[PDB]
Amino acid sequence: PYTWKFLGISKQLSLENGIAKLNQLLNLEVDLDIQTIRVPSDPDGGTAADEYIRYEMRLDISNLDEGTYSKFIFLGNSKMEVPMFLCYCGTDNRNEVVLQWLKAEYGVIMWPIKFEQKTMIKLADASIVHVTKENIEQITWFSSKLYFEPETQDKNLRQFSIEIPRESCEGLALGYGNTMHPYNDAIVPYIYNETGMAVERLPLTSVILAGHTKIMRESIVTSTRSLRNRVLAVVLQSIQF
Amino acid sequence: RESSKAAILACAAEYIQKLKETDEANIEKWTLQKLLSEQNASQLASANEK
Amino acid sequence: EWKKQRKDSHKEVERRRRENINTAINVLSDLLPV
Amino acid sequence: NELRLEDNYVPTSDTLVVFKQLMKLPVTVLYDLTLSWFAKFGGSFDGDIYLLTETLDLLIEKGVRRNVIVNRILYVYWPDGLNVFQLAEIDCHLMISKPEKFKWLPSKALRGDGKPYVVKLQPAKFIENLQTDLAKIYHCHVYMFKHPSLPVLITRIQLFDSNKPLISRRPYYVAFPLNSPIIFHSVDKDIYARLVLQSISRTISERETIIFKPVQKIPVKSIHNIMTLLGPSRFAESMGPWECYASANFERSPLHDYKKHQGLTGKKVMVREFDDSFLNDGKEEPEIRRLRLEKNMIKFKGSANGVMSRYSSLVPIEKVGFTLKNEINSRIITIKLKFNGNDIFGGLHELCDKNLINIDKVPGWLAGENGSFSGTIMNGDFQREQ
């Protein structure tokens, strides 16, 4: 279980400017990664709006020490208002020393990331979707459950949950048909369809998939090796105005 | 007999379904034979009472 | 490393095997009248 | 077999635990018990009843602190110990004072194949048979008392062990309604729980085999509430929106006057939109606001005024977990809902007031119908959990 801390960027910055001068303050070597790929918003075609640039590096020498392991993953655009954001995992001094170094370098100031219901559910859609080496999209499904914590007096109803077996998830999407957003057309309406509760209006605490991710508003938790690309893209649009 | 538990459960489900289907078919054919016998009895009893 | 990737693949296979039994027993419990 | 205990045995109960039992009882009830206690078994006080009731009256006159009188009855009147009958009295008086602190579980009595057996308990005969069936194994002492404002007959059974004074165990409470197959008993999972409950079934039958089946698995406190929930009453099987039928106040007698019949007056109603306009959203008229708030109360309380602040339901429940199964495209879709809180159906009512949940599309089981029962739902029919 790895907990990810999210964080945004005010204006677009350049990070490969001085990897030689980012090390003497820290006294050990740090590598560089330059990478960009296609992020198809629509399978039929994609404009220049999905042009994304991603950076990644670490601060470590000891591979045996799995606990003292941290990664800083960057990704974002350059044409909309907010250019990019950033994410990191783990607690250490290495998670901030570079952070001050670009505190006083570029003039960008940080802010915690806010999630609400309009965004929280749609993250699991990007988590469950998969891409192969032949650019073929198939979905690996998971038995999602939701956490609800409604604020009330007398604490009459303080917490309740909804659980869906994902074979029934299979039976819902197939009934709707081939959809790229299963939670738009098979799951979320069906809860309103039967029980009459609006998931989005109600205060949602957590969306849990079966052993793949752990989504909460305060922070996202995932047991994978590294976060994917569709997740970061949907986060970027959500925090965009 | 099978080793994997999933195969055991699938075979149990198939066994239940097969048993139910066989029972239904037997009931249907026996009901048809019952109808034939009842028709024969009625058609003979009509002449008897006449 | 290679060992870590092998461990991740083993974990994924184990999770799939665990979920298959749950799906099968859910189907069985569906078939039962009680 | 003289293993039964009389009303004069003195177990070696700790002074501290019985000190805390008298802690909760009010001052005015301590005076009443002390006068009755001396009239039955006496005490170590060197005086008559008149002398005792004189000094005890003076403790009231001076406003004497309860710690003094509690120490007086524990270290002066009965320094040696406390009687079993006195312990039963303090237990039952604590039961009456604080009925919300004790939990109960329902159980059903069956005779033959599936014919329910209504219980008819004789206060005398039910005692000696139970004593005979229990003393052959363990020391047994029982006490019966009737609820002051309820028709139930609460029976407490305590069992003693030899490890020489006897060591008291946790008492077992079994509540018998007047005439109902349902029997409410306390929660216990020890050697004594299966020995006391089993002995009761053999004792109360006396002519045919009687078996006990647990109706529910989640205990509910407030013995007053469980009687309305599952005991013999009109409100059983007509809860939720159908609570108006339990108390036939909407319909007048045939001999009653016919101008007051609501056929002439009619009812004030509002049109509900069958087209889905709840998802998208203008300030509502106060009259429209009042009618909208009335719709929520009708489907959770059963009437505009309410059978019973306003969000409290008739019977609060803690945990209810539903399971919904439907068939779509020749396969079953299962959704499991679990609720937890103080008043589940009261909480859902408030959320409908804040426009979070559509009031038109909530089903009957979510509205409070057949409450306190959790089970699978199919084809619009509710099935209780086995």
Closest CA to A180 of A231, A130, A116, A238: A130
Tell me which method was used to determine the 3D structure.
cryo-EM
CB contact under 8 Å between B10 and C21, yes or no, is no
Three-state secondary structure readout of chain A: CEEEEEEECCCCCCCCCCCCCCCCCCCCCCCCCEECCCCCCCCCCCCHHHCCEEEEEECCCCCCCCCCCCEEEEEECCCCCCCEEEEEECCCHHHCHHHHHCHHHHCCCCCCCCCCHHHHHHHHHHHHEEECCCCCEEECCCCCEEEECCCCHHHCCCEEEEECCHHHHHHHHHHHCCCCCHHHHHHHHHHHHHCCECCCCCCEEEEECCCCEEEECCCEEECCCCCCHHHHHHHHHHHCC
Compute, in degrees rounded to 10, the torsion defined by CA atoms A194, A198, A204, A209: 40
Q: Who contacts D100 (Cβ-Cβ below 8 Å, separation ≥6)?
A: D221, D222
Secondary structure of residue D131 in the 3-state scheme: helix
User: Residue D123 and residue D145: Cα distance in Å, rounded?
Assistant: 10
Is-contact A191 A197, C-beta < 8 A?
yes
Cα distances (Å, whole numbers) of residue D371 to A141, A152, A153, D108, D368: 35, 21, 21, 18, 5
Angle (CA) D73-D75-D78 rounded to 5° is: 60
Nearest to D343 by CA among B21, A210, A213, A154: A154
Distances (CA, A) of D365 to A165, D218, D300, D313: 21, 18, 11, 15
Q: What φ, ψ does residue D256 adopt, rounded to 5°?
A: -70, 165
**Nearest alpha carbon to residue A13 among A111, A112, A103, A94:** A103
Tokens of A38: 């296609």
Burial A175-207 (b: 16+ CB within 10 A, else e): eeeeeeebbebbbbebbbebbbbbbebbebbbb
Q: What tokens does D123 get?
A: 């206060």
Inter-residue contact A188 to A164 (CB < 8 Å): no
**How far is Cα D123 from Cα D130, in angstroms, rounded to an integer?**
12
Continuous H helices in chain D: 15-24, 27-41, 49-61, 66-72, 84-97, 125-135, 193-205, 223-230, 243-246, 262-265, 286-301, 344-353, 364-367
Beta carbons of D345 and D317 less than 8 angstroms apart: yes
D334 phi/psi in degrees, rounded to 5: -115, 130
| A-chain residues near D355 (CB < 8 A) | 201
Cβ–Cβ contacts within 10 Å for residue A211, how many?
15
Q: Count Cβ atoms within 10 A of the Cβ of residue D142 and give its class: 0-12 exposed, 13-18 middle, 19 or more buried.
A: buried
| Residue D339 distance to chain A (closest CA, Å) | 5
Query: Which residue do the tokens 């609006």 mark?
Result: A198
> D211 pairs with which residues across the strands?
D110
Cα separation, D285 vs D291, whole angstroms: 10
- The answer to whether residues A83 and A9 touch, using CB atoms and an 8 Å cutoff, is yes
Contacts of B10 in chain C (CB under 8 A): 24
Burial label for D212, CB within 10 Å (0-12, 13-18, 19+), is middle
3-state secondary structure of D244: helix
- Where do the domains of chain A lie? 1-241
As a whole number of angstroms, the distance between CA D182 and CA D115 comes to 13
DSSP D75: I
Nearest CB neighbour to D333, from listed A160, A172, A198: A172
Q: What is D252-282 written as a DSSP string?
A: --TTS-SSSSHHHH--------SS--SS---
Do A and D touch (≥3 CB pairs < 8 Å)?
yes
Torsion of the alpha carbons at A173, A174, A177 and A183, rounded to the nearest 10: 0
What are the structure tokens assigned to D150, written together?
Answer: 């309820």
If you ran DSSP here, which 8-state letter would residue D327 be given?
E
Q: How far apart are the first and last CA of chain A?
A: 31
Query: What DSSP string runs through C1-34?
Result: -HHHHHHHHHHHHHHHHHHHHHHHHHHHHHH---
- Which chain C residue has its CA at the smallest distance from A140's CA? C16
CB-CB contact of A95 with A178 (8 Å): no
User: Are B32 and B38 contacting, i.e. CB atoms less than 8 angstroms apart?
Assistant: no
For D207, list phi and psi in degrees, rounded to 5: -140, -25
Q: Report CA-CA distances (Å) from B1 to A238, B42, C30, D4, D57.
A: 54, 51, 23, 58, 84
Cα separation of the two ends of chain C: 50
Chain C 1-34, residues with CB within 8 Å of chain B CB atoms:
20-21, 24-25, 27-28, 31
Distance CA D366, CA D382 (A): 11
Question: Using CA atoms, how far apart are residues D227 and D238, in angstroms rounded to an integer?
Answer: 14
Q: Beta A204-208 vs D319-327: how paired, if at all?
A: unpaired
- CB of D216 within 8 A of CB of D373? yes
A89 - beta bridge partners? A4
How far apart are the C-alpha atoms of D50 and D68, rounded to whole Å? 21
Phi/psi for A84 (5° steps) reads: -155, 180
Q: With beta carbons less than 8 A apart as the criterion, state whether A214 and A221 touch.
A: yes
Look at C21 and B5 and tell me if their CB atoms are within 8 Å. Answer: yes
* Those residues with Cβ within 8 angstroms of residue A237's Cβ, 6 or more apart along the chain or in another chain: none
Cβ(A47)–Cβ(A79) under 8 Å?
no
Specify whether the CB–CB gap between D129 and D201 falls below 8 A: no
DSSP letter string, D345-381: HHHHHHHHHTTSB-SSS--HHHHTTTTT---EEETTE
Name the β-bridge partners of D146: D153
Chain B interface residues (partner C, CB cutoff 8 A): 5-6, 9-10, 12-13, 16-17
Give the separation between CA D195 and CA D137, rounded to whole angstroms.
Answer: 10
Please tell me the distance in Å from A63's CA to the nearest CA on chain C.
9
Distance from the A239 Cα atom to the nearest Cα atom in chain D, whole angstroms: 23
DSSP reduced 3-state for B6: helix
**C-alpha distances in Å from residue B14, one per residue of B6, B8, C28:** 12, 10, 10
> How many angstroms separate the CA atoms of A54 and A74, rounded?
5
Give backbone dihedrals phi and psi of A184, rounded to 5 degrees, phi first.
Answer: -80, -30
Residues 6+ apart with CB under 8 A from D43: D37, D52, D77, D78
Is residue D54 within 8 Å of residue D34, measured between CB atoms?
A: no
Spell D35-60 as b/e; 16+ CB within 10 A means b. eebbeeeeeebeeeeeebeeebeebe
Contacts of A159 in chain D (CB under 8 A): 340-341
Asked if D352 and D363 count as a contact pair (C-beta separation under 8 A), the reply is no
The 3-state DSSP class for residue D167 equals strand
Of the residues A142, A167, A226, the best mutation for testing chain C's interface (the one with the most C CB atoms within 10 Å of its CB) is A167
**C near B: at least 3 beta-carbon pairs less than 8 Å apart:** yes
Q: d(Cα D149, Cα A48) in Å, to the nearest integer?
A: 79
Structure tokens at A109: 């100031």
Taking an 8 Å cut-off on Cβ atoms, the answer to whether C8 and A225 are in contact is yes
- Residue-wise over B34-43: b if at least 16 C-beta within 10 A, else e? eeeeeeeeee
What letter does residue D166 receive in the DSSP assignment? P
